[PDB]
Amino acid sequence: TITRPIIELSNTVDKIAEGNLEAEVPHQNRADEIGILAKSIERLRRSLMRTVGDVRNGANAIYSGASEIATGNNDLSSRTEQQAASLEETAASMEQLTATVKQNAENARQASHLALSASETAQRGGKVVDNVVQTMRDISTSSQKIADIISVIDGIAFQTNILALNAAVEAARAGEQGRGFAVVAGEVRNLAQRSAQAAREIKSLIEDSVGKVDVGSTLVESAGETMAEIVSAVTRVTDIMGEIASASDEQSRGIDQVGLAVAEMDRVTQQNAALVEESAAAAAALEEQASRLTEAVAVFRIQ
């Protein structure tokens, strides 16, 4: 009659070892030693209850974090993709910028060699204009000297025309003798007049002509302004180029420093890719680790 209860308690233990936690523990009301032991066992049953409970909450917590890492992961993923896409868009561009910079530098270096060329052919043309200016001055002098001497020949004609008067008057001193004389004096007069005609034609021609040299002189002189002016505008072109070259090998070393920061960045993007794959693996591992913990106490029927 002690046999019956302690066997019953033994069964109770068994029933607990199978994970049956919800059944009452018998004999807790006895005030004999059996009661002490039943109480011990009810205490066991309670202590197991709380443990399964804790483990189960632990499993569900972790299943929660697994799920949270996961969705935090799926973000960093497509967000990291976005980054690598953005990063190639900027790689593409820095390649175009080196292309365009290198070209602009050669294109400046051309213009410069080209302008110095204009400069040097303008200076040569400068010196050829000098010579022309000079030779115009000479022509101007010669031409005035011609005006001068032709006016003298007009004088002589006038004068020899006057002597024809005297020769006529000296001829008529022997009428019938100075008849031939009279003809000569006539001839002289005729020769003077034609000779004056020629003189005056030349006056017209030479005065006109003098007009022309002075005009041609101002034209040639301006042709020299022109050379000076070109040289000037073409030099300022050469400077402008010196400056473009300087801002180009400048842009060159700045593109350069950017390509470097970009290598940095696709290195870190690459790593974020790695981090993502790993983080997915961690999540999976956590999920299964909660599965195992749940399974470890799942036979237990509680409360």
| Binding residues vs Cl ion (CB under 5 A) | 101, 104, 248
CA distance readout (Å), 53 to 2, 105, 206: 35, 77, 133
223 binds a copy of itself (CB under 8 A): yes
Binding mask 39-78 toward a copy of itself (x if CB under 8 A, else -) reads xxx-xx--x---x--xx-xx--xx--x--xx--x--xx--
38 close to 9: Cβ distance less than 8 angstroms: yes
94 close to 262: Cβ distance less than 8 angstroms: yes
Instruction: Determine the 3-state secondary structure of 145 from DSSP.
Output: helix
For residue 252 the two structure tokens come to 């060159």
Residue 106, judged by CB atoms within 10 A of its CB (0-12, 13-18, 19+), counts as: exposed
167 binds a copy of itself (CB under 8 A): yes
- Of residues 168-197, those binding a copy of itself (CB under 8 A): 170-171, 173-174, 177-178, 180-181, 184-185, 187-188, 191-192, 194-195
Please compute Rg for the chain using Cα positions: 63
Nearest approach in angstroms of CB 46 to Cl ion is 7
104 binds a copy of itself (CB under 8 A): yes
Report the C-alpha dihedral over residues 92, 98, 100, 106, rounded to 10 degrees.
-160
Binding mask 118-157 toward a copy of itself (x if CB under 8 A, else -) reads x--xx-xx--xx-xx--xx-xx--xx-xx--xx-xx--xx
Beta-carbon contacts of residue 182 (< 8 Å; ≥ 6 apart): 168, 171, 172
- Of residues 199-218, those binding a copy of itself (CB under 8 A): 199, 201-202, 205-206, 208-209, 212-213, 215-216
| Rounded distance between C-alpha atoms, residue 56 and residue 118, angstroms | 92
C-beta closer to a copy of itself: residue 10 or 22:
10
234 binds a copy of itself (CB under 8 A): yes
Q: Is 27 annotated as a binding residue?
A: yes
Residue 6: alpha-carbon gap to chain centroid: 96
Q: Would you say how long the chain is, in residues?
A: 303
The residue within the footprint of a copy of itself, chosen from 22, 23, 250, 301 (CB under 8 A), is: 250
Nearest approach in angstroms of CB 34 to Cl ion is 21
# residues near a copy of itself by CB under 8 A: 160
The residue within the footprint of a copy of itself, chosen from 20, 90, 273, 280 (CB under 8 A), is: 90
Question: Quick one: what does residue 21 bind among a copy of itself, Cl ion, none, with the CB cut-off 5 to 8 Å set by partner type?
Answer: none
101 close to 252: Cβ distance less than 8 angstroms: yes
Query: Among residues 58, 7, 53, which one has the least CA distance to residue 34?
Result: 7
Question: Quick one: what does residue 301 bind among Cl ion, a copy of itself, none, with the CB cut-off 5 to 8 Å set by partner type?
Answer: none
The residue within the footprint of a copy of itself, chosen from 22, 23, 254, 301 (CB under 8 A), is: 254
The label of the residue with tokens 């299943």 reads: 63
Nearest approach in angstroms of CB 55 to a copy of itself is 6
* Binding-site sequence positions for Zn(2+): 8, 27
* Binding-site sequence positions: 8, 27
